Structures are given as C-alpha cells and as structure tokens.
Amino acid sequence: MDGDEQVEYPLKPIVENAKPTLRQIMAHFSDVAEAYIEMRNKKEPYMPRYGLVRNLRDGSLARYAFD
Amino acid sequence: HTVPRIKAITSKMRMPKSKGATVLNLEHLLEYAPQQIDISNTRATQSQFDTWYEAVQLAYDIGETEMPTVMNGLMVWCIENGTSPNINGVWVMMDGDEQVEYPLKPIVENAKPTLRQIMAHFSDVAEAYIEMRNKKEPYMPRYGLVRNLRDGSLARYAFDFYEVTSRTPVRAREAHIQMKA
Amino acid sequence: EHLLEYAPQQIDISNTRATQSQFDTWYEAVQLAYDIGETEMPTVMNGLMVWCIENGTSPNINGVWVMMDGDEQVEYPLKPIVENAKPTLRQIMAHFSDVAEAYIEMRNKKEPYMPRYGLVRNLRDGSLARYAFD
C-alpha cells in the first residue's frame, strides 16, 4: 500500500523457497504480530480474517487469532 | 518510506537482421492488416480465378451477360456432388423439369491448382443458398449425407469445398474433423 | 576460466533457429532472384511473415504467395523462398517468430483474430492466439 493505491509482488518466490512450509518459516514473525494486532485494536475493532471466519466471535482474543 | 516496487525488466524484442540491418519494416507492418479471407492457401489467387472464369467463357462460347446464369448452376451442382469428378463428363442444370448438360472438360482442366481450391470462392455464398433451401424443406447436401453424418441444422456447413475462417461456429468448426477423418 | 563468463543468450544456441550465416544466405539469395532493391525488400519480407502466419510453413514448392495493395492481389513466386531455406523453411523463418507475437496482439486489439493453423487444430481459445502459428 502506498497512500490508497496498490502495489503487487509475485508470490512464486516467497512460497517456493519456504522450507519446510510457509507456515513453519513465517512463524518467526508470530511473536511480533501480537504487537501489531494490539496496536491496531487500540484505535478500532480489529479482527484478522482467519479467526473471523472460524465461527469465532471474541474481541479481546483477537491478538491470538492468525494462522 | 518509498515502499520499493519490483523493477520491471522489459525483454527487448529481437528483430531479424542481416548485415547489421533490420529486415522487417516496422512502419508498414503497423498498418498492413489484410482480411483473413484474402491471404489463404485454400482460396485461389484473383489471377488464377480470373483465368478460369475467362477461359471457361471462351470454351462454352456464351455471352458475358448470360454467363452468370451458367455459374449460378455450377455452384449448385458442385454442392450436391464432390469437387473432383471425372474429367470427361457432364454436369446438369435445369429448365422447368428438363435437363441441359455442359461438358466438364473445360471446367476441371483450367482450374489451377485444383477445382476445390478455386471454386472455394463460392463457399461463402453457398451458405446463403443452403439456408434458403432449408427454410422450405429438410435439405442436406449429398456429401455430408453419405459421410456418416445425421445433423440437420449443421447442413449449412456440409459441402466439399467449404473454407473455414475465424467466424465459423465451433459446432461447424469441430464438424469437419469427423467428416474428413 | 572461460566457462565462468561464457553465458550466451538462450535465444542464440538452439536447434530450431537457423544460424546467422544460413539466414543471411537465404535473405540475400531471395533478393537476387526477385531482383528488388535492398531499400524496398523490407516491404516484401513484411508480407512474407504475415502470409506464413495464416498458412503453414511447408507449402507447395511451385506456387505463389499473395500480399496486398489496397484491395488487390500481387503475387510472388514461391520457388526461390522455399528452396534456399536451409535446413527447412520452419527452422529459418523462426527468426520472425518473436515479432509475430507483436503483430498478432496488435491485430487482436481491434477484432477477434485467430491464425488459420490453430484455428483448424481443434483449438478454441481466444487470448492464446498470440502463440498459435506454425
């Protein structure tokens, strides 16, 4: 995102050089993601789309609701 | 804070070149857009069709004001039969429940390269004639009739000298695969 | 040593494209046979690619190919073109294969354009037509 416009990047290099799996390597960011979600939830009701569409409804828990 | 955008690499096109000089003329190429109907290996060139049409006129010895009638029956005759008949023989037309015949030697001998590849000029019109006939009776050309085919509506695309372009329906386009198998 | 910097383009070392010498002989020999000035031959080859898109690349040795001047036909003998093409007309005219994509895309931007080869090859896809010549 650059000021209400979209820039795109190819996804082939990202999801192909991720051994063993993208989940098991991007989990390095899982610790920081809590800080980002908490910061966002301090200005608006923020809920990640994963736990959003997982029958879940709790708000405060949203800090722990990504894949 | 410029959020780097993946740089775009434009793979430069490779013009054919001889002795360090481009062969294609890029200018003329940008407006050289002829009809698909024109540049084909099926249809005969306008010169070859002109020679055939003129040579047939001299052999039959018929006035140019009346020849349109003669060629009017030539297309109809060639729909009902093939486009590679016997060199020696006749084709039949019609004046009120009687037959008039014309020798077939001049027609099938001055047709370069082949009678199919030169009579295909009539292939566009033949669709209009067949559709008109099918609007009053179940009409089927004898070629697709005896080619294991049974479809009725398709009959507009079931003669021997049919040429195929980009505007033929897929049902018509896939049909010629099976008949010409 | 040399192997660490010997990195030529893939376009160059192929068994499909003809060598620059063989393409040079064909382009020069056709010029002598047709007897056309080098300043005007670009026009002639401009229609040769378009003609070979609409048909195959293995036609009859004896015959003609058609070009166009304002709804009229001009023909050129096909014997010199298909006889001085070593090893084969397909393997030497493939120099034009890169440009042909640009021409087809330009045509398809104004009408539904499909080369007659892929047209009569059981194929039906439209956007793919940029990659459907012989």
Residue numbers in the entry:
A (entry chain Aj): 135 to 201
B (entry chain Aa): 42 to 222
C (entry chain Ab): 68 to 201
Please quote the paper that reports this structure.
Potyviral CP plays a role in virtually every step of the viral infection cycle, from transmission of the virion by aphids, virus assembly and disassembly, regulation of genome amplification, protein translation, to cell-to-cell and long-distance movement. CP consists of a highly conserved globular core flanked by two large extended regions with a high frequency of structural disorder. The C-terminal high intrinsic disorder region (C-IDR) is partially conserved and packaged in the lumen of the virion, supported by the helical ssRNA scaffold. Here, we show that we can control the shape, size, RNA encapsidation ability, symmetry, stability and surface functionalization of nanoparticles through structure-based design of CP from potato virus Y (PVY).
In this study, we found that the wild type PVY CP can indeed form three architecturally distinct types of VLPs simultaneously. A comprehensive analysis of the cryo-EM data revealed two new filament architectures in addition to the predominant RNA-free stacked ring assembly (VLPr) that we had previously observed. In the absence of RNA in VLPr and VLPh, the C-IDR in CPr and CPh is disordered, with no traceable cryo-EM density beyond A222. The fold of the CP core domain is conserved between the polymorphic filaments, except for the conserved RNA-binding loop S125-G1306, which adopts different conformations in the presence or absence of RNA. In all three structures, there was no cryo-EM density for the first 41 residues of N-IDR, exposed on the outer surface of the filaments. Beyond H42, N-IDR in CPh+RNA folds similarly to that in PVY virus, whereas N-IDR in CPr and CPh takes a different turn at K53. In the absence of ssRNA, the N-IDRs adopt two slightly different conformations, as seen in CPr and CPh allowing the formation of two different types of RNA-free filaments, with the stacked octameric ring assembly being the more stable and therefore predominant form. Interestingly, only a slight change in N-IDR conformation leads to the formation of another type of RNA-free filaments with left-helical symmetry.
